[PDB]
Protein backbone atom coordinates (compact mmCIF):
# COMPACT_ATOMS: atom_id res chain seq x y z
CA UNK A 1 0.00 0.00 0.00
CA UNK A 2 3.03 2.29 0.34
CA UNK A 3 3.62 1.84 -3.39
CA UNK A 4 -0.10 1.98 -4.24
CA UNK A 5 -0.36 5.37 -2.50
CA UNK A 6 3.02 6.73 -3.66
CA UNK A 7 1.64 7.24 -7.18
CA UNK A 8 -0.07 10.54 -6.32
CA UNK A 9 2.54 13.31 -6.51
CA UNK A 10 4.63 11.67 -9.24
CA UNK A 11 1.60 11.54 -11.56
CA UNK A 12 -1.45 13.80 -11.69
CA UNK A 13 -3.85 10.97 -12.60
CA UNK A 14 -1.67 8.14 -11.28
CA UNK A 15 0.58 5.90 -13.37
CA UNK A 16 -1.30 2.93 -14.85
CA UNK A 17 -0.26 0.41 -17.51
CA UNK A 18 -1.43 0.51 -21.11
CA UNK A 19 -2.88 -2.06 -23.50
CA UNK A 20 -0.70 -1.63 -26.60
CA UNK A 21 2.42 -2.62 -24.63
CA UNK A 22 0.61 -4.34 -21.72
CA UNK A 23 2.88 -2.48 -19.32
CA UNK A 24 4.94 0.70 -19.05
CA UNK A 25 5.46 3.22 -21.84
CA UNK A 26 8.34 4.72 -23.81
CA UNK A 27 7.92 8.15 -25.39
CA UNK A 28 4.65 8.23 -23.42
CA UNK A 29 1.77 10.32 -24.75
CA UNK A 30 -1.23 11.11 -22.55
CA UNK A 31 -4.32 10.84 -24.74
CA UNK A 32 -7.34 13.11 -24.17
CA UNK A 33 -8.92 10.03 -22.55
CA UNK A 34 -6.07 10.15 -19.98
CA UNK A 35 -4.23 6.96 -20.95
CA UNK A 36 -0.43 6.77 -21.02
CA UNK A 37 0.53 5.12 -24.31
CA UNK A 38 3.98 4.20 -25.61
CA UNK A 39 4.64 5.91 -28.95
CA UNK A 40 7.22 3.27 -29.87
CA UNK A 41 4.62 0.58 -29.17
CA UNK A 42 1.93 2.86 -30.64
CA UNK A 43 3.61 2.62 -34.05
CA UNK A 44 3.54 -1.20 -34.07
CA UNK A 45 -0.27 -1.18 -33.86
CA UNK A 46 -0.91 2.05 -35.80
CA UNK A 47 1.01 0.87 -38.87
CA UNK A 48 -2.22 -0.99 -39.71
CA UNK A 49 -4.01 2.36 -40.30
CA UNK A 50 -6.80 1.55 -37.81
CA UNK A 51 -6.51 4.01 -34.91
CA UNK A 52 -8.28 2.07 -32.15
CA UNK A 53 -7.42 2.23 -28.45
CA UNK A 54 -8.48 -1.20 -27.11
CA UNK A 55 -8.20 -0.21 -23.43
CA UNK A 56 -10.97 2.41 -23.26
CA UNK A 57 -12.45 1.48 -26.68
CA UNK A 58 -12.25 5.08 -27.90
CA UNK A 59 -12.53 5.69 -31.65
CA UNK A 60 -10.23 8.70 -31.64
CA UNK A 61 -10.60 11.07 -34.61
CA UNK A 62 -7.83 10.87 -37.19
CA UNK A 63 -7.05 14.57 -36.72
CA UNK A 64 -5.41 13.95 -33.33
CA UNK A 65 -1.77 12.84 -33.57
CA UNK A 66 -0.04 11.32 -30.53
CA UNK A 67 3.51 12.62 -30.28
CA UNK A 68 6.53 12.88 -27.98
CA UNK A 69 6.21 14.48 -24.54
CA UNK A 70 9.28 15.46 -22.52
CA UNK A 71 7.86 16.23 -19.07
CA UNK A 72 5.57 13.21 -19.28
CA UNK A 73 8.49 11.00 -20.33
CA UNK A 74 10.66 12.09 -17.41
CA UNK A 75 7.73 11.74 -14.99
CA UNK A 76 7.19 8.17 -16.20
CA UNK A 77 10.87 7.19 -16.12
CA UNK A 78 11.42 8.60 -12.62
CA UNK A 79 8.84 6.18 -11.21
CA UNK A 80 9.95 3.43 -13.60
CA UNK A 81 13.28 3.47 -11.79
CA UNK A 82 11.72 4.35 -8.40
CA UNK A 83 9.54 1.34 -7.83
CA UNK A 84 11.91 -1.21 -9.35
CA UNK A 85 14.84 -0.16 -7.16
CA UNK A 86 12.68 0.20 -4.05
CA UNK A 87 10.94 -3.17 -4.28
CA UNK A 88 14.06 -5.07 -5.33
CA UNK A 89 16.37 -3.68 -2.66
CA UNK A 90 13.73 -4.02 0.06
CA UNK A 91 12.93 -7.63 -0.85
CA UNK A 92 16.57 -8.71 -0.93
CA UNK A 93 17.48 -6.97 2.33
CA UNK A 94 14.40 -8.31 4.09
CA UNK A 95 15.37 -11.77 2.84
CA UNK A 96 18.65 -11.07 4.63
CA UNK A 97 16.80 -10.47 7.91
CA UNK A 98 13.90 -12.91 7.37
CA UNK A 99 16.30 -15.88 6.99
CA UNK A 100 19.37 -15.05 9.08
CA UNK A 101 19.75 -17.98 11.48
CA UNK A 102 19.83 -21.71 10.79
CA UNK A 103 16.23 -22.18 11.97
CA UNK A 104 13.70 -21.87 9.12
CA UNK A 105 11.09 -19.22 9.96
CA UNK A 106 7.94 -21.25 9.26
CA UNK A 107 6.19 -23.36 6.66
CA UNK A 108 3.71 -20.58 5.88
CA UNK A 109 6.29 -17.82 5.35
CA UNK A 110 8.18 -19.69 2.64
CA UNK A 111 4.99 -21.05 1.06
CA UNK A 112 3.60 -17.51 0.88
CA UNK A 113 6.87 -16.25 -0.61
CA UNK A 114 6.74 -19.00 -3.24
CA UNK A 115 3.14 -18.14 -4.11
CA UNK A 116 4.21 -14.48 -4.25
CA UNK A 117 7.01 -15.66 -6.54
CA UNK A 118 4.32 -15.84 -9.25
CA UNK A 119 2.27 -12.72 -9.99
CA UNK A 120 -1.23 -13.01 -8.55
CA UNK A 121 2.10 -16.49 -17.35
CA UNK A 122 2.54 -17.03 -13.62
CA UNK A 123 6.18 -15.90 -13.32
CA UNK A 124 6.56 -12.56 -15.07
CA UNK A 125 7.66 -10.14 -12.34
CA UNK A 126 10.95 -9.88 -10.44
CA UNK A 127 9.80 -11.64 -7.25
CA UNK A 128 7.83 -8.82 -5.63
CA UNK A 129 4.60 -8.51 -3.61
CA UNK A 130 3.17 -6.07 -6.18
CA UNK A 131 1.70 -6.42 -9.69
CA UNK A 132 4.90 -5.44 -11.52
CA UNK A 133 5.08 -5.49 -15.31
CA UNK A 134 5.68 -8.44 -17.66
CA UNK A 135 9.38 -9.20 -18.10
CA UNK A 136 11.13 -11.47 -20.63
CA UNK A 137 10.02 -15.10 -21.15
CA UNK A 138 9.75 -16.60 -17.64
CA UNK A 139 13.25 -16.98 -16.20
CA UNK A 140 13.70 -19.39 -13.30
CA UNK A 141 15.39 -17.07 -10.81
CA UNK A 142 17.49 -18.76 -8.13
CA UNK A 143 18.21 -15.51 -6.27
CA UNK A 144 16.06 -16.67 -3.34
CA UNK A 145 16.62 -20.41 -3.80
CA UNK A 146 20.19 -20.22 -2.47
CA UNK A 147 19.05 -18.43 0.69
CA UNK A 148 16.28 -21.02 0.92
CA UNK A 149 18.95 -23.75 0.80
CA UNK A 150 21.50 -22.67 3.44
CA UNK A 151 19.52 -24.68 6.01
CA UNK A 152 19.96 -28.42 6.52
CA UNK A 153 19.07 -30.31 3.35
CA UNK A 154 16.95 -32.96 5.08
CA UNK A 155 14.74 -30.39 6.83
CA UNK A 156 14.21 -28.46 3.57
CA UNK A 157 13.67 -31.51 1.34
CA UNK A 158 9.92 -30.86 1.50
CA UNK A 159 10.61 -27.23 0.61
CA UNK A 160 12.70 -28.22 -2.42
CA UNK A 161 10.07 -30.73 -3.57
CA UNK A 162 7.31 -28.12 -3.26
CA UNK A 163 9.46 -25.58 -5.12
CA UNK A 164 10.12 -27.97 -8.01
CA UNK A 165 6.44 -28.96 -8.17
CA UNK A 166 5.34 -25.33 -8.40
CA UNK A 167 8.02 -24.68 -11.03
CA UNK A 168 6.78 -27.59 -13.15
CA UNK A 169 3.26 -26.12 -12.90
CA UNK A 170 4.53 -22.75 -14.15
CA UNK A 171 3.59 -22.57 -17.84
CA UNK A 172 3.91 -24.32 -21.23
CA UNK A 173 7.70 -24.53 -20.82
CA UNK A 174 9.29 -27.74 -22.10
CA UNK A 175 9.64 -30.52 -19.51
CA UNK A 176 13.34 -31.04 -20.32
CA UNK A 177 14.34 -31.20 -16.65
CA UNK A 178 18.04 -31.39 -17.57
CA UNK A 179 18.70 -27.64 -17.71
CA UNK A 180 17.03 -27.03 -14.33
CA UNK A 181 18.19 -30.25 -12.65
CA UNK A 182 21.81 -29.29 -13.32
CA UNK A 183 21.12 -25.85 -11.83
CA UNK A 184 19.51 -27.38 -8.73
CA UNK A 185 22.42 -29.82 -8.31
CA UNK A 186 24.98 -27.03 -8.67
CA UNK A 187 23.12 -24.79 -6.21
CA UNK A 188 22.84 -27.50 -3.57
CA UNK A 189 26.51 -28.30 -4.19
CA UNK A 190 27.37 -24.67 -3.47
CA UNK A 191 25.21 -24.73 -0.34
CA UNK A 192 26.75 -27.92 1.03
CA UNK A 193 30.33 -26.85 0.27
CA UNK A 194 29.77 -23.40 1.81
CA UNK A 195 27.99 -24.71 4.93
CA UNK A 196 29.79 -28.03 5.53
CA UNK A 197 33.38 -27.65 4.24
CA UNK A 198 34.58 -24.48 6.01
CA UNK A 199 34.83 -25.30 9.72
CA UNK A 200 38.57 -26.04 10.08
CA UNK A 201 41.15 -28.62 9.05
CA UNK A 202 40.51 -30.97 11.98
CA UNK A 203 36.72 -30.68 11.69
CA UNK A 204 37.01 -31.21 7.93
CA UNK A 205 39.09 -34.37 8.30
CA UNK A 206 36.68 -35.70 10.93
CA UNK A 207 33.81 -34.97 8.52
CA UNK A 208 35.68 -36.75 5.71
CA UNK A 209 36.29 -39.79 7.94
CA UNK A 210 32.61 -39.91 8.90
CA UNK A 211 31.59 -39.61 5.24
CA UNK A 212 33.93 -42.46 4.32
CA UNK A 213 32.53 -44.64 7.09
CA UNK A 214 28.96 -43.90 5.99
CA UNK A 215 29.88 -44.74 2.40
CA UNK A 216 31.20 -48.03 3.77
CA UNK A 217 27.77 -48.48 5.40
CA UNK A 218 26.00 -47.86 2.10
CA UNK A 219 14.54 -37.30 -10.91
CA UNK A 220 14.15 -37.22 -7.13
CA UNK A 221 15.98 -34.50 -5.21
CA UNK A 222 17.48 -37.27 -3.07
CA UNK A 223 19.10 -38.69 -6.21
CA UNK A 224 20.30 -35.21 -7.18
CA UNK A 225 21.85 -34.68 -3.74
CA UNK A 226 23.49 -38.12 -3.88
CA UNK A 227 24.92 -37.32 -7.32
CA UNK A 228 26.24 -33.98 -6.08
CA UNK A 229 27.78 -35.46 -2.92
CA UNK A 230 29.54 -38.26 -4.81
CA UNK A 231 30.69 -35.66 -7.35
CA UNK A 232 32.18 -33.57 -4.54
CA UNK A 233 33.79 -36.67 -3.04
CA UNK A 234 35.41 -37.69 -6.34
CA UNK A 235 36.54 -34.12 -7.05
CA UNK A 236 38.09 -33.95 -3.57
CA UNK A 237 39.82 -37.27 -4.19
CA UNK A 238 41.05 -35.99 -7.57
CA UNK A 239 42.60 -32.74 -6.38
CA UNK A 240 43.80 -34.52 -3.22
CA UNK A 241 45.74 -37.09 -5.27
CA UNK A 242 46.58 -34.57 -8.03
CA UNK A 243 49.75 -33.51 -6.23
CA UNK A 244 53.35 -33.69 -7.47
CA UNK A 245 56.02 -35.98 -6.01
CA UNK A 246 57.13 -35.01 -2.52
CA UNK A 247 54.39 -36.39 -0.31
CA UNK A 248 55.11 -40.10 0.27
CA UNK A 249 54.31 -39.61 3.97
CA UNK A 250 50.85 -38.67 5.35
CA UNK A 251 49.50 -41.72 3.41
CA UNK A 252 47.93 -42.97 6.66
CA UNK A 253 44.69 -41.28 5.55
CA UNK A 254 45.65 -40.78 1.88
CA UNK A 255 45.86 -44.50 1.12
CA UNK A 256 42.55 -45.00 2.93
CA UNK A 257 40.73 -42.19 1.10
CA UNK A 258 41.99 -43.02 -2.39
CA UNK A 259 41.30 -46.73 -1.83
CA UNK A 260 37.76 -46.08 -0.60
CA UNK A 261 37.06 -43.71 -3.51
CA UNK A 262 38.24 -46.37 -5.96
CA UNK A 263 36.10 -48.92 -4.12
CA UNK A 264 33.03 -46.73 -4.66
CA UNK A 265 34.05 -46.25 -8.31
CA UNK A 266 34.30 -50.03 -8.72
CA UNK A 267 30.98 -50.64 -6.95
CA UNK A 268 28.86 -48.01 -8.73
CA UNK A 269 29.29 -49.74 -12.14
CA UNK A 270 29.07 -46.30 -13.81
CA UNK A 271 31.76 -44.68 -15.96
CA UNK A 272 30.25 -41.19 -15.72
CA UNK A 273 32.06 -40.60 -12.42
CA UNK A 274 35.46 -41.52 -13.85
CA UNK A 275 34.97 -39.60 -17.10
CA UNK A 276 34.01 -36.63 -14.92
CA UNK A 277 37.19 -37.15 -12.89
CA UNK A 278 39.22 -37.15 -16.12
CA UNK A 279 37.52 -33.92 -17.23
CA UNK A 280 38.18 -32.34 -13.83
CA UNK A 281 41.86 -33.34 -13.92
CA UNK A 282 42.20 -31.96 -17.45
CA UNK A 283 40.68 -28.68 -16.29
CA UNK A 284 43.01 -28.77 -13.26
CA UNK A 285 46.34 -29.09 -15.06
CA UNK A 286 45.72 -29.93 -18.72
CA UNK A 287 44.63 -32.72 -21.04
CA UNK A 288 48.30 -33.26 -21.94
CA UNK A 289 49.09 -34.33 -18.38
CA UNK A 290 46.23 -36.83 -18.34
CA UNK A 291 47.24 -38.08 -21.80
CA UNK A 292 50.84 -38.61 -20.70
CA UNK A 293 50.45 -39.83 -17.12
CA UNK A 294 47.69 -42.30 -18.03
CA UNK A 295 49.70 -43.84 -20.85
CA UNK A 296 48.92 -47.43 -21.94
CA UNK A 297 50.51 -49.81 -19.44
CA UNK A 298 51.13 -47.34 -16.61
CA UNK A 299 50.54 -48.89 -13.15
CA UNK A 300 48.64 -45.67 -12.38
CA UNK A 301 45.49 -46.74 -14.20
CA UNK A 302 42.97 -47.60 -11.47
CA UNK A 303 41.77 -43.99 -11.20
CA UNK A 304 41.43 -43.55 -14.97
CA UNK A 305 38.95 -45.59 -17.06
CA UNK A 306 39.81 -49.07 -18.31
CA UNK A 307 37.96 -49.53 -21.61
CA UNK A 308 39.31 -46.14 -22.67
CA UNK A 309 42.79 -47.42 -21.78
CA UNK A 310 42.30 -50.52 -23.95
CA UNK A 311 40.90 -48.65 -26.97
CA UNK A 312 43.72 -46.12 -26.60
CA UNK A 313 46.35 -48.84 -26.44
CA UNK A 314 44.90 -50.07 -29.72
CA UNK A 315 45.50 -46.47 -30.89
CA UNK A 316 48.95 -46.05 -29.32
CA UNK A 317 50.43 -44.56 -32.51
CA UNK A 318 49.05 -41.11 -31.60
CA UNK A 319 50.02 -40.09 -28.04
CA UNK A 320 48.05 -36.84 -27.86
CA UNK A 321 50.60 -34.11 -28.65
CA UNK A 322 47.85 -32.06 -30.27
CA UNK A 323 48.75 -28.91 -32.22
CA UNK A 324 47.32 -26.13 -30.03
CA UNK A 325 48.28 -23.48 -32.63
CA UNK A 326 44.92 -23.58 -34.42
CA UNK A 327 44.03 -20.08 -33.17
CA UNK A 328 45.37 -18.59 -36.42
CA UNK A 329 43.17 -20.60 -38.76
CA UNK A 330 42.90 -23.70 -40.91
CA UNK A 331 45.42 -22.19 -43.34
CA UNK A 332 48.21 -22.90 -40.85
CA UNK A 333 46.93 -26.46 -40.56
CA UNK A 334 47.05 -26.78 -44.35
CA UNK A 335 50.66 -25.64 -44.71
CA UNK A 336 51.61 -27.68 -41.63
CA UNK A 337 50.35 -30.96 -43.08
CA UNK A 338 51.86 -30.03 -46.45
CA UNK A 339 55.26 -29.46 -44.83
CA UNK A 340 55.00 -32.69 -42.84
CA UNK A 341 54.14 -34.70 -45.96
CA UNK A 342 56.90 -33.05 -48.00
CA UNK A 343 59.57 -33.71 -45.37
CA UNK A 344 58.40 -37.29 -44.77
CA UNK A 345 58.38 -38.16 -48.49
CA UNK A 346 61.70 -36.35 -49.13
CA UNK A 347 60.69 -33.68 -51.64
CA UNK A 348 60.33 -29.88 -51.52
CA UNK A 349 57.27 -29.51 -53.78
CA UNK A 350 54.87 -30.34 -50.94
CA UNK A 351 55.94 -27.26 -48.99
CA UNK A 352 55.98 -25.19 -52.19
CA UNK A 353 52.36 -26.10 -52.99
CA UNK A 354 51.25 -24.41 -49.77
CA UNK A 355 53.85 -21.67 -50.30
CA UNK A 356 52.21 -20.52 -53.53
CA UNK A 357 48.69 -20.43 -52.04
CA UNK A 358 49.31 -17.85 -49.32
CA UNK A 359 47.85 -14.36 -49.78
CA UNK A 360 48.99 -13.17 -46.33
CA UNK A 361 52.04 -10.93 -45.84
CA UNK A 362 55.34 -12.81 -45.87
CA UNK A 363 56.29 -11.85 -42.29
CA UNK A 364 53.75 -14.08 -40.57
CA UNK A 365 54.29 -16.48 -43.48
CA UNK A 366 57.89 -16.96 -42.33
CA UNK A 367 56.46 -17.19 -38.81
CA UNK A 368 54.30 -20.09 -40.01
CA UNK A 369 57.31 -21.67 -41.71
CA UNK A 370 59.46 -21.58 -38.57
CA UNK A 371 56.60 -22.67 -36.31
CA UNK A 372 55.74 -25.62 -38.57
CA UNK A 373 59.44 -26.51 -38.65
CA UNK A 374 59.25 -26.58 -34.86
CA UNK A 375 55.97 -28.53 -34.77
CA UNK A 376 57.43 -31.28 -36.94
CA UNK A 377 61.17 -31.50 -36.27
CA UNK A 378 61.32 -30.53 -32.59
CA UNK A 379 58.29 -32.58 -31.56
CA UNK A 380 59.50 -35.65 -33.48
CA UNK A 381 62.95 -35.16 -31.92
CA UNK A 382 61.47 -34.71 -28.43
CA UNK A 383 60.93 -38.46 -28.19
CA UNK A 384 63.92 -40.36 -26.82
CA UNK A 385 63.74 -42.87 -29.69
CA UNK A 386 66.34 -41.97 -32.32
CA UNK A 387 64.35 -43.94 -34.90
CA UNK A 388 61.35 -41.65 -34.35
CA UNK A 389 63.62 -38.62 -34.77
CA UNK A 390 63.69 -37.00 -38.23
CA UNK A 391 66.29 -38.77 -40.33
CA UNK A 392 69.57 -37.01 -41.22
CA UNK A 393 68.54 -37.33 -44.87
CA UNK A 394 65.43 -35.33 -43.95
CA UNK A 395 67.75 -32.81 -42.29
CA UNK A 396 69.72 -32.45 -45.53
CA UNK A 397 66.44 -32.18 -47.45
CA UNK A 398 65.21 -29.30 -45.30
CA UNK A 399 68.71 -27.78 -45.47
CA UNK A 400 68.72 -27.69 -49.26
CA UNK A 401 65.13 -26.43 -49.04
CA UNK A 402 66.12 -23.46 -46.88
CA UNK A 403 68.98 -22.94 -49.32
CA UNK A 404 66.37 -23.20 -52.08
CA UNK A 405 63.72 -20.85 -50.70
CA UNK A 406 64.64 -17.20 -50.15
CA UNK A 407 61.60 -16.25 -48.05
CA UNK A 408 63.73 -16.37 -44.88
CA UNK A 409 65.65 -13.24 -45.82
CA UNK A 410 66.79 -12.18 -42.28
CA UNK A 411 69.97 -13.99 -41.19
Amino acid sequence: ECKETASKTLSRFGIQPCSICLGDAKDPVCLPCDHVHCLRCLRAWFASEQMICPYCLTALPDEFSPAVSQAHREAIEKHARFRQMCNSFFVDLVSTICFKDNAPPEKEVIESLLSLLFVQCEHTKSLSPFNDVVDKTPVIRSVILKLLLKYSFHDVKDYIQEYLTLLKKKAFITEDKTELYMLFINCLEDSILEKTSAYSRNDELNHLEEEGRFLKAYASVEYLQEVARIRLCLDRAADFLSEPEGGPEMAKEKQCYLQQVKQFCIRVENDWHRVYLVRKLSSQRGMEFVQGLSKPGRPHQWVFPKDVVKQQGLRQDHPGQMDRYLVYGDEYKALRDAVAKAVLECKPLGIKTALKACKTPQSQQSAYFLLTLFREVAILYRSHNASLHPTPEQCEAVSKFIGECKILSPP
Binding site: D92, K136, T137, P138, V139, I140, R141, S142, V143, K146, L147, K150, I173, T174, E179, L180, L183, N186, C187, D190, L193, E194, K195, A198
Partner: protein, 145 residues
Protein backbone atom coordinates in the same frame (compact mmCIF):
# COMPACT_ATOMS: atom_id res chain seq x y z
CA UNK B 1 39.88 -2.73 15.58
CA UNK B 2 41.60 -5.25 13.27
CA UNK B 3 39.83 -6.36 10.11
CA UNK B 4 39.97 -10.04 11.06
CA UNK B 5 38.83 -12.70 8.60
CA UNK B 6 39.94 -16.03 7.18
CA UNK B 7 40.15 -17.06 3.54
CA UNK B 8 38.00 -20.16 4.13
CA UNK B 9 35.95 -19.21 7.20
CA UNK B 10 34.10 -16.01 6.17
CA UNK B 11 35.32 -15.29 2.62
CA UNK B 12 34.36 -18.35 0.58
CA UNK B 13 31.10 -19.06 2.50
CA UNK B 14 29.99 -15.48 1.87
CA UNK B 15 31.14 -15.33 -1.75
CA UNK B 16 29.52 -18.67 -2.65
CA UNK B 17 26.30 -17.64 -0.87
CA UNK B 18 25.88 -14.94 -3.54
CA UNK B 19 27.03 -16.83 -6.66
CA UNK B 20 23.89 -16.44 -8.76
CA UNK B 21 22.85 -19.25 -11.11
CA UNK B 22 20.13 -18.10 -13.52
CA UNK B 23 18.86 -20.16 -16.46
CA UNK B 24 17.01 -18.67 -19.43
CA UNK B 25 15.02 -20.85 -21.81
CA UNK B 26 17.15 -21.80 -24.80
CA UNK B 27 20.32 -20.42 -23.18
CA UNK B 28 22.88 -21.62 -20.65
CA UNK B 29 23.45 -20.29 -17.13
CA UNK B 30 24.33 -16.71 -16.20
CA UNK B 31 26.76 -16.21 -13.32
CA UNK B 32 26.71 -12.48 -12.55
CA UNK B 33 26.78 -11.90 -8.80
CA UNK B 34 25.37 -9.13 -6.61
CA UNK B 35 28.61 -7.21 -6.25
CA UNK B 36 26.85 -4.32 -4.51
CA UNK B 37 25.31 -6.76 -2.02
CA UNK B 38 28.73 -8.37 -1.57
CA UNK B 39 30.22 -4.98 -0.72
CA UNK B 40 27.33 -4.31 1.67
CA UNK B 41 27.86 -7.64 3.44
CA UNK B 42 31.62 -7.08 3.71
CA UNK B 43 31.29 -3.50 4.97
CA UNK B 44 28.70 -4.65 7.51
CA UNK B 45 30.52 -7.69 8.90
CA UNK B 46 34.12 -6.41 8.76
CA UNK B 47 34.58 -2.87 7.44
CA UNK B 48 32.61 -1.02 10.11
CA UNK B 49 34.39 2.09 11.36
CA UNK B 50 37.50 1.36 13.42
CA UNK B 51 40.56 3.57 12.79
CA UNK B 52 44.08 3.92 14.14
CA UNK B 53 46.98 6.45 14.69
CA UNK B 54 50.66 5.61 15.15
CA UNK B 55 52.04 7.21 18.31
CA UNK B 56 53.96 4.49 20.19
CA UNK B 57 55.42 1.00 19.94
CA UNK B 58 58.88 2.29 20.83
CA UNK B 59 61.49 0.50 23.02
CA UNK B 60 61.67 3.14 25.75
CA UNK B 61 63.96 1.06 27.92
CA UNK B 62 65.40 2.13 31.26
CA UNK B 63 68.64 3.83 30.23
CA UNK B 64 69.48 3.78 26.48
CA UNK B 65 72.70 5.80 26.64
CA UNK B 66 71.97 8.95 28.67
CA UNK B 67 74.25 11.81 29.83
CA UNK B 68 74.45 14.64 27.32
CA UNK B 69 73.91 18.26 28.33
CA UNK B 70 72.97 19.54 24.86
CA UNK B 71 69.50 17.97 24.85
CA UNK B 72 69.13 18.96 28.50
CA UNK B 73 69.87 22.57 27.53
CA UNK B 74 67.44 22.31 24.61
CA UNK B 75 64.71 21.21 27.02
CA UNK B 76 65.61 24.08 29.36
CA UNK B 77 65.46 26.68 26.59
CA UNK B 78 62.27 25.32 25.00
CA UNK B 79 60.48 25.00 28.36
CA UNK B 80 61.25 28.52 29.66
CA UNK B 81 63.21 31.68 28.88
CA UNK B 82 66.88 31.90 29.89
CA UNK B 83 68.77 35.16 30.35
CA UNK B 84 72.53 35.81 30.54
CA UNK B 85 74.80 36.36 33.53
CA UNK B 86 75.12 40.05 34.52
CA UNK B 87 78.61 41.53 34.70
CA UNK B 88 78.14 42.50 38.35
CA UNK B 89 77.21 38.90 39.18
CA UNK B 90 80.20 37.46 37.31
CA UNK B 91 82.55 39.92 39.04
CA UNK B 92 81.09 39.09 42.46
CA UNK B 93 81.35 35.34 41.85
CA UNK B 94 84.91 35.55 40.51
CA UNK B 95 85.75 37.58 43.61
CA UNK B 96 84.16 35.30 46.20
CA UNK B 97 85.00 31.99 44.45
CA UNK B 98 88.64 31.59 45.46
CA UNK B 99 88.84 27.78 45.38
CA UNK B 100 88.15 24.90 43.02
CA UNK B 101 86.15 23.07 45.70
CA UNK B 102 83.74 26.00 46.12
CA UNK B 103 83.14 26.07 42.37
CA UNK B 104 82.58 22.31 42.41
CA UNK B 105 79.99 22.56 45.20
CA UNK B 106 78.14 25.44 43.51
CA UNK B 107 78.11 23.57 40.19
CA UNK B 108 76.90 20.42 41.97
CA UNK B 109 73.92 22.39 43.27
CA UNK B 110 73.38 23.99 39.84
CA UNK B 111 73.33 20.60 38.09
CA UNK B 112 70.51 19.28 40.29
CA UNK B 113 68.73 22.59 39.75
CA UNK B 114 69.07 22.09 35.99
CA UNK B 115 67.73 18.55 36.18
CA UNK B 116 64.65 19.58 38.15
CA UNK B 117 64.13 22.71 36.03
CA UNK B 118 64.08 20.50 32.93
CA UNK B 119 61.93 17.63 34.17
CA UNK B 120 59.35 20.02 35.68
CA UNK B 121 59.91 23.67 34.80
CA UNK B 122 59.28 26.72 36.94
CA UNK B 123 59.13 30.49 37.32
CA UNK B 124 62.12 32.18 35.61
CA UNK B 125 61.93 34.98 38.21
CA UNK B 126 62.07 32.82 41.35
CA UNK B 127 65.28 33.24 43.32
CA UNK B 128 67.65 30.29 43.00
CA UNK B 129 68.35 30.14 46.74
CA UNK B 130 64.60 29.68 47.27
CA UNK B 131 64.10 27.04 44.58
CA UNK B 132 66.97 25.03 46.06
CA UNK B 133 65.87 25.60 49.67
CA UNK B 134 62.11 25.10 50.04
CA UNK B 135 61.09 23.81 46.60
CA UNK B 136 63.61 20.95 46.32
CA UNK B 137 64.13 20.86 50.12
CA UNK B 138 67.94 20.80 49.84
CA UNK B 139 68.34 21.54 53.53
CA UNK B 140 72.05 20.72 53.76
CA UNK B 141 73.67 23.55 51.80
CA UNK B 142 76.68 25.40 53.20
CA UNK B 143 76.77 29.16 53.76
CA UNK B 144 79.21 29.93 50.93
CA UNK B 145 76.98 28.39 48.25
Amino acid sequence: HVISYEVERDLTPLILSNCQYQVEEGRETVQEFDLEKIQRQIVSRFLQGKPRLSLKGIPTLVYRHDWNYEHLFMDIKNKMAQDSLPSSVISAISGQLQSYSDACEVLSVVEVTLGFLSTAGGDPNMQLNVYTQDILQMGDQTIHV
